[PDB]
Design a protein around this ligand. Sequence first.
Ligand SMILES: *[C@@]1([N])=N[C]=NC2=C1N=[C]N2[C]1O[C]([C]OP([O])(=O)OP([O])(=O)O[C][C]([O])[C]([O])[C]([O])[C]N2C3=[C]C([C])=C([C])[C]=C3N=C3C(=O)[N]C(=O)N=C32)[C]([O])[C]1[O]
Ligand SMILES: Cc1cc2nc3c(=O)[nH]c(=O)nc-3n(C[C@H](O)[C@H](O)[C@H](O)COP(=O)(O)OP(=O)(O)OC[C@H]3O[C@@H](n4cnc5c(N)ncnc54)[C@H](O)[C@@H]3O)c2cc1C
Lengths: 397, 444
Amino acid sequence: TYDLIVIGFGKAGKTLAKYAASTGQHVAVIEQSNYHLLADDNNIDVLDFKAQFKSNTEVNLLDQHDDIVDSITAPHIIINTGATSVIPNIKGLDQAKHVFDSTGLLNISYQPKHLVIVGGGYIALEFASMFANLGSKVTVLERGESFMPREDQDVVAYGITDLENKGIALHTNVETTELSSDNHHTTVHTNVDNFEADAVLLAIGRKPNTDLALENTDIELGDRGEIKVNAHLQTTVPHIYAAGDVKGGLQFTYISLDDYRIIKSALYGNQSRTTDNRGSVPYTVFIDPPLSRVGLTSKEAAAQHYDYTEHQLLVSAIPRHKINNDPRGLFKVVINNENNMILGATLYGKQSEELINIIKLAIDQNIPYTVLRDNIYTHPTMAESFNDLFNFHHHHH
Amino acid sequence: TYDLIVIGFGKAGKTLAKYAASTGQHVAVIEQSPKMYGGTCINIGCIPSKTLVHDGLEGKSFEASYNRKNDVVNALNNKNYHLLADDNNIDVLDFKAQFKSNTEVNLLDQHDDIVDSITAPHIIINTGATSVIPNIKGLDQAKHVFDSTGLLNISYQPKHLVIVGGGYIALEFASMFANLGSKVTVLERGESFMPREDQDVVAYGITDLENKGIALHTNVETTELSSDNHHTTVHTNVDNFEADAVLLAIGRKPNTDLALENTDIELGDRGEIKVNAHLQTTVPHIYAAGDVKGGLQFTYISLDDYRIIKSALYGNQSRTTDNRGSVPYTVFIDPPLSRVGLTSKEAAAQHYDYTEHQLLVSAIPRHKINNDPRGLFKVVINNENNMILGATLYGKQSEELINIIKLAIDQNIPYTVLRDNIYTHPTMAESFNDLFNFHHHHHH
Ligand SMILES: *[C@@]1([N])=N[C]=NC2=C1N=[C]N2[C]1O[C]([C]OP([O])(=O)OP([O])(=O)O[C][C]([O])[C]([O])[C]([O])[C]N2C3=[C]C([C])=C([C])[C]=C3N=C3C(=O)[N]C(=O)N=C32)[C]([O])[C]1[O]
Ligand SMILES: Cc1cc2nc3c(=O)[nH]c(=O)nc-3n(C[C@H](O)[C@H](O)[C@H](O)COP(=O)(O)OP(=O)(O)OC[C@H]3O[C@@H](n4cnc5c(N)ncnc54)[C@H](O)[C@@H]3O)c2cc1C
């Protein structure tokens, strides 16, 4: 019988357990398979079992033999079980060899001479960049009509160019029909071609990890197998919360950290934090250079009928690029003309994963783009490019 | 006759010249050296200095780094020149400018002869600074003694570089040349290195420099320089140091060699051109921008001087030296030491009820990706209103991150916003979640 139980070792549950322990509460963390910073705490018991609900109030602990070892309870339970790679139903998967998801690839024994990636998502493009830099010939197959479709399209054109210049082969409108393996190698059979590879990466998305007997509970699932949560991350049973990837939406480590803020606010604070007031959420696609994003693209701003102005700056026009010895990239911003507020930004270039946080703060705090234009920046840096990136007049659309 | 005369191809000058020309005005820009097209930063300052620091961090040799420094300097010098000269409303005049009167400027060739004279209703003095040559016995006879600019053009890698001076520029050359394999000794006359900086963070730079093999000394009075033919000895009160090359880096003074006696332009206690809050000299139609008017010597201060002068001559005159906002800066040692606002010593001396909180870079998970555990992040907060008084970031990406805290200070964003914000991951910026967490609720 505990004070708080978190199920899973994600970021939200781990930091929530550490906070509750400093309060003095006795916490139970259930994790099937950093590590000491939780166990070594006097007020936290990490249980190496598999969690499975017996009711809305008690949780069964299963050993590796799927036997019930013990049952545990607490007035509040946090579900934080993450997600798993989506396995595609294709011909010859269970028999094919040298096939990997994202986790299996990160633990690969060898460097592939030819890595084929089925899937063209952000994670897929990241791995293609990481392995081209390591000398691997990389082919990636996208089923859709274009790469990174939710991103600004003449920025991604620069990204595709820089990816191709590294020897990466991109393909669009590719249906993959069959996988076969001649033992040491594996061939991917597609609509356009049949590629031979040393390793095949399945990178076609992650689906919530919802395996803990929800039939014994009143916890509901949404359209896509995610745990349904309200604005305070409450499931349909009010004393049980869901955080991280196991509920729907954005799958980021920092979103999981913000989930802890919401749940702590609901359980220990004034309950003012919700999923409706996270502020603008930035993200980075770690290609080379990194593509960082926050707010709208100009395509979205035009679709929502903003009176907007967009402006761009090639990284080759940024003098700091000469010190970096890297001319690749494109910086792009979208501005609201009514006020002078920033609607969104796409920074494709070095330091973009750091610079993007400046624009995030400006959007949240209603700092007009004129302030970023006229500000004093350190020199020589990439940040000082904001003197030029935001140096423009209204073009009224 | 021109509409605007700019004396010196500095940062404020070239930027103001380019704007006025877009307006339709005819601008004359006087620059004495064709090796100086673009200013001190492009040719003998920030750009060549940090090109060598960046390349030395990458394992490039001395010869390879210096060759790429030449290409980068030559490319930007040529770029800066044509950005101005090719404008139909800007004439770049290759002469030394000297005032004939309050209203017209002589153009002198390198033999100090007057070739012609020009005039304009507004004149901008943007002549920068020069290295302070110290009065030391044997300097005018010692060999292998270098400027900051002489060192950036050195034709050999020194086995032992001895640095007279311990300012920011001196420590940047020490780190730069240590990373290139040179043995470096640096000598500071004062009691301590980098005063006015958070001396807790300074002790980190010091140890990180010493762990690279840099020898540092304080309370050192350099009394004499002597040289044989291939070695130079620096005679001090503690020791004699034998060197391949000696760097004199003890500050830079305003360059006012403009025959100001033919004008009513006044000079201040420290040889600077006196200016008001709108950067007007004591002659109202003459402005002074950049290093020559004293104060902070940075390229971005010079760029902000263009904003003040443009505001005064073309805009609503609201921009002054009194509303620049908080001024960040970076000392480009390895990793860079970046700073904005008050030090905790300053906050304590003014009697704030302040909170200081630090975070070691080795406690930032991104450092493992960076392959560098060195650094210390530090913030100083006013406890009565949660405002950010200052910060010192010593670590990777600090020269970028410091601009976030600058923005927060200027806009009166309380530290709790930076503490609770969502940051990209994995980054150095997300360390702010911990750096700005004072753990007030960490109790029973
Ligand atoms: C049961 N039944 N009982 C006990 N414990 C259980 C259990 N089922 C599962 N588990 C355990 O639960 C945890 C879950 O951990 P985690 O971290 O998945 O939880 P959470 O809070 O949802 O975290 C989400 C977050 O980690 C994730 O979004 C990021 O990893 C996303 N991400 C990312 C992901 C992949 C797959 C790759 C290849 C790369 C990246 N890169 C980034 C990136 O650069 N930035 C970013 O912000 N996010 C990235 C587990 O231990 C189970 O055993
Ligand atoms: C080694 C070193 C490293 C530095 N690193 C950095 C750094 O990393 N970041 C940073 O922000 N700052 C840095 N600085 C400072 C920066 O170089 C200066 O603060 C800045 O360039 C000042 O520019 P300015 O507008 O005052 O004029 P300057 O850029 O100094 O230009 C003045 C110009 O006027 C010309 N001139 C002078 N007198 C006459 C005359 N009579 N007639 C005609 N022309 C004339 C000169 O030839 C020169 O081209 C560094 C400085 C040095 C020395």
